[PDB]
Amino acid sequence: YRARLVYPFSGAISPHADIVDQATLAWAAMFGLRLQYGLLAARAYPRADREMLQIAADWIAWLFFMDDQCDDLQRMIALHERFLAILDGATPEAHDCALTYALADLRRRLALRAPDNWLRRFSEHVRLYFTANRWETVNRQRGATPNVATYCAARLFSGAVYACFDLIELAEQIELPFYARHHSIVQQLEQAANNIICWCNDVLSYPKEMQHGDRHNLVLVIQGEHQCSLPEAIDRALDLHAREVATFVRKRTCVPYFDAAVNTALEKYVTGLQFWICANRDWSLTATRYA
Amino acid sequence: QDYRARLVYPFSGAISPHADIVDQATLAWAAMFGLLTDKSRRLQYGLLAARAYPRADREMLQIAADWIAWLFFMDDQCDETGIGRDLQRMIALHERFLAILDGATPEAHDCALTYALADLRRRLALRAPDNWLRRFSEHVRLYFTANRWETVNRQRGATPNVATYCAARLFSGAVYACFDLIELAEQIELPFYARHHSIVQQLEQAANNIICWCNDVLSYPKEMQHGDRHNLVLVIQGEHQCSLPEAIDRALDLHAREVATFVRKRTCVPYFDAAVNTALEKYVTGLQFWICANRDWSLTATRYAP
Ligand SMILES: CC(C)=CCC/C(C)=C/CC[C@H](C)CCOP(=O)(O)OP(=O)(O)O
Ligand SMILES: CC(C)=CCC/C(C)=C/CC[C@H](C)CCOP(=O)(O)OP(=O)(O)O
Ligand SMILES: [Mg+2]
Ligand SMILES: [Mg+2]
Ligand SMILES: [Mg+2]
Ligand SMILES: [Mg+2]
Numbered sequence: 001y002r003a004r005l006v007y008p009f010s011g012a013i014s015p016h017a018d019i020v021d022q023a024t025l026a027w028a029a030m031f032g033l034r035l036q037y038g039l040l041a042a043r044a045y046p047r048a049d050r051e052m053l054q055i056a057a058d059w060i061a062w063l064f065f066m067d068d069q070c071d072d073l074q075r076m077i078a079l080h081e082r083f084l085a086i087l088d089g090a091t092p093e094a095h096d097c098a099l100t101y102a103l104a105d106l107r108r109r110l111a112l113r114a115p116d117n118w119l120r121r122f123s124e125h126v127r128l129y130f131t132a133n134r135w136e137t138v139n140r141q142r143g144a145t146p147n148v149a150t151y152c153a154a155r156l157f158s159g160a161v162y163a164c165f166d167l168i169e170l171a172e173q174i175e176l177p178f179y180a181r182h183h184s185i186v187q188q189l190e191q192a193a194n195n196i197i198c199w200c201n202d203v204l205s206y207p208k209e210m211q212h213g214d215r216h217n218l219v220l221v222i223q224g225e226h227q228c229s230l231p232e233a234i235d236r237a238l239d240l241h242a243r244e245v246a247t248f249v250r251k252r253t254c255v256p257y258f259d260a261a262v263n264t265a266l267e268k269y270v271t272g273l274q275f276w277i278c279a280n281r282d283w284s285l286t287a288t289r290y291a
Numbered sequence: 292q293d294y295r296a297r298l299v300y301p302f303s304g305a306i307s308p309h310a311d312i313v314d315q316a317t318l319a320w321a322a323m324f325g326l327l328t329d330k331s332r333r334l335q336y337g338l339l340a341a342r343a344y345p346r347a348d349r350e351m352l353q354i355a356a357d358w359i360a361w362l363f364f365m366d367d368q369c370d371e372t373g374i375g376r377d378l379q380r381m382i383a384l385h386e387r388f389l390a391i392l393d394g395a396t397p398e399a400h401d402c403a404l405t406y407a408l409a410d411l412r413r414r415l416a417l418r419a420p421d422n423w424l425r426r427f428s429e430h431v432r433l434y435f436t437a438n439r440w441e442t443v444n445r446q447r448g449a450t451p452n453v454a455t456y457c458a459a460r461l462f463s464g465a466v467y468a469c470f471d472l473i474e475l476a477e478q479i480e481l482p483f484y485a486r487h488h489s490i491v492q493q494l495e496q497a498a499n500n501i502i503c504w505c506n507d508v509l510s511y512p513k514e515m516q517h518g519d520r521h522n523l524v525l526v527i528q529g530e531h532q533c534s535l536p537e538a539i540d541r542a543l544d545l546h547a548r549e550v551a552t553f554v555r556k557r558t559c560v561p562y563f564d565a566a567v568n569t570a571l572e573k574y575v576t577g578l579q580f581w582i583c584a585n586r587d588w589s590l591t592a593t594r595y596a597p
Contacts, residue, residue: 002332003332010311010312011311012308012309013306013307013308013310013311013341014306014308015305015306015307015308015345016305017306017310018303018304018306018342018583018587019303019304022295025295036591039591042306043311046308278311282311285332285333286333286335286593288596291333291593
């Protein structure tokens with residue numbers, strides 16, 4: 001089943017991978033938060049300078065530490081409120097959670113690297129991530145059973161992949177005009193890449209999520225919808241992954257010609273989406289997390 | 292349990308950008324030569340090679356990755372199967388390998404590893420002069436000799452003292468054979484007088500010791516589990532009759548001391564001429580890439596996980 005997570009393109013890894021992974025474990029220790037999160041970041045942004053790769057690695061660590069620590073809606077609503085204050089630029093006062101201080105450091109370091117325009121886009125993607133998490137949490141407690149369409153539409157935001165795609169611009173040191181960033185084909189390539197990354201994860205993490213009574217997983221949602229066996233649910237999930245890869249590859253050639261400079265930056269951005277798709281698969285296949 | 296904090300080097304490694312592509316190509320090579328028996332996708336032997344030869348061209352890196360894979364496939368038979376306890380079977384196999392290293396063509400019913408070694412020999416012959424193949428072949432011969440010596444220890448239920456173990460370990464780990472590949476990876480030639488210089492040999496010895504003793508600390512659990520005692524931790528524990536934690540501390544102390552020796556001896560390389568000293572500084576950088584590669588890969592490799 002795992003062997004069927006395949007792409008017609010290949011990834012790359014930063015030569016700095018291990019130095020970043022060590023500095024991530026050092027960073028997590030400093031803020032009081034096996035793992036190899038730096039080796040995901042090193043594959044996801046393989047051309048990035050060491051300074052920018054380290055921010056991306058520390059951000060990716062934060063998301064995993066967040067996902068792990070959360071293991072109660074009133075408590076979740078309270079925490080998300082303040083994270084967003086930090087993201088928009090509120091000082092981490094006393095009695096703040098370790099994660100809040102860590103997020104304050106990431107915002108601080110990104111502010112040195114990116115314009116206000118970028119910080120807003122990143123912040124909005126993070127807000128939608130929190131919203132999607134609160135939605136999944138309610139479903140869990142209330143025992144709600146979302147269909148495949150609903151799960152997949154929510155999964156695009158619950159995985160925070162869009163926040164990670166925002167870092168591609170900083171890694172690649174590219175600027176895209178509003179009209180190119182928001183173009184329907186660019187959005188459809190981002191959606192395809194996000195679905196591929198999430199559905200790859202779901203196929204690899206379903207055993208983990210079954211054990212902990214979580215059903216927010218494509219294989220588990222497909223199983224419930226079709227009233228079918230686990231092997232058929234896995235087969236259906238990998239068919240959707242295969243179809244989404246075909247869709248990404250096809251739409252790559254549908255990007256309009258704006259001008260030389262804009263299309264150069266767009267080619268780098270889409271190459272960045274491919275690096276992230278391969279990074280997710282290459283990293284997850286080896287990761288202790290899904291063993 | 293975590294020894295990262297006690298395996299520190301004052302130099303850093305690097306990894307080839309093609310690390311994952313190289314590992315996938317190694318699995319295909321392994322499959323092609325029928326070396327995969329029974330989690331092939333978590334071996335990650337390409338990810339060690341990618342770190343050990345980080346600046347190598349994809350073709351030379353692929354030979355290095357397949358060679359490192361070959362050593363692990365071979366090693367697992369010796370260190371976990373009956374051939375490692377049968378000197379007469381080991382002598383028979385080594386005679387076939389040695390024939391192949393000299394350039395003999397594999398017979399129809401030579402074992403998978405013999406066919407695989409012949410492929411590596413052919414590919415190295417395309418990339419290396421005859422003098423190199425002789426140096427490589429001799430280091431591999433000493434590896435076989437050291438493994439037969441380990442086999443006799445397993446057979447007799449013997450444990451060597453620290454001095455004897457460490458002296459044998461420099462050959463049983465095949466690190467010198469892997470060091471030979473640095474020359475091809477970095478596309479350098481050293482003249483005989485530079486290659487054999489006392490200080491160059493002492494730097495290779497220290498680098499080899501560091502790699503083996505780092506491995507011994509990280510691999511003592513899986514080796515205890517198979518009843519193997521060819522491990523600095525287990526030999527120290529045998530000699531001093533001390534606790535396992537004391538043995539580990541003593542092993543990590545020797546590792547630290549060897550790192551210090553390597554770093555200080557770096558500055559003792561004589562000036563021969565511009566060309567040779569540029570090639571030697573490239574080579575010594577190569578030893579540092581290997582030292583880091585060994586630790587960086589081993590800390591996260593499934594091979595050394597409980
Ligand atoms: C954890 C996180 C939000 C992001 C890490 C970085 C990243 C975008 C990785 C891709 C894998 C997938 C989208 C994780 C989603 O969280 P999920 O809870 O499905 O991850 P898990 O299967 O590892 O528990
Ligand atoms: C397998 C082999 C001879 C070499 C692979 C490449 C290499 C030079 C690796 C460095 C670590 C160490 C020398 C492994 C061999 O010893 P050992 O048998 O203790 O390896 P293990 O602890 O991984 O089983
Ligand atoms: Mg998951
Ligand atoms: Mg989860
Ligand atoms: Mg072994
Ligand atoms: Mg060992």
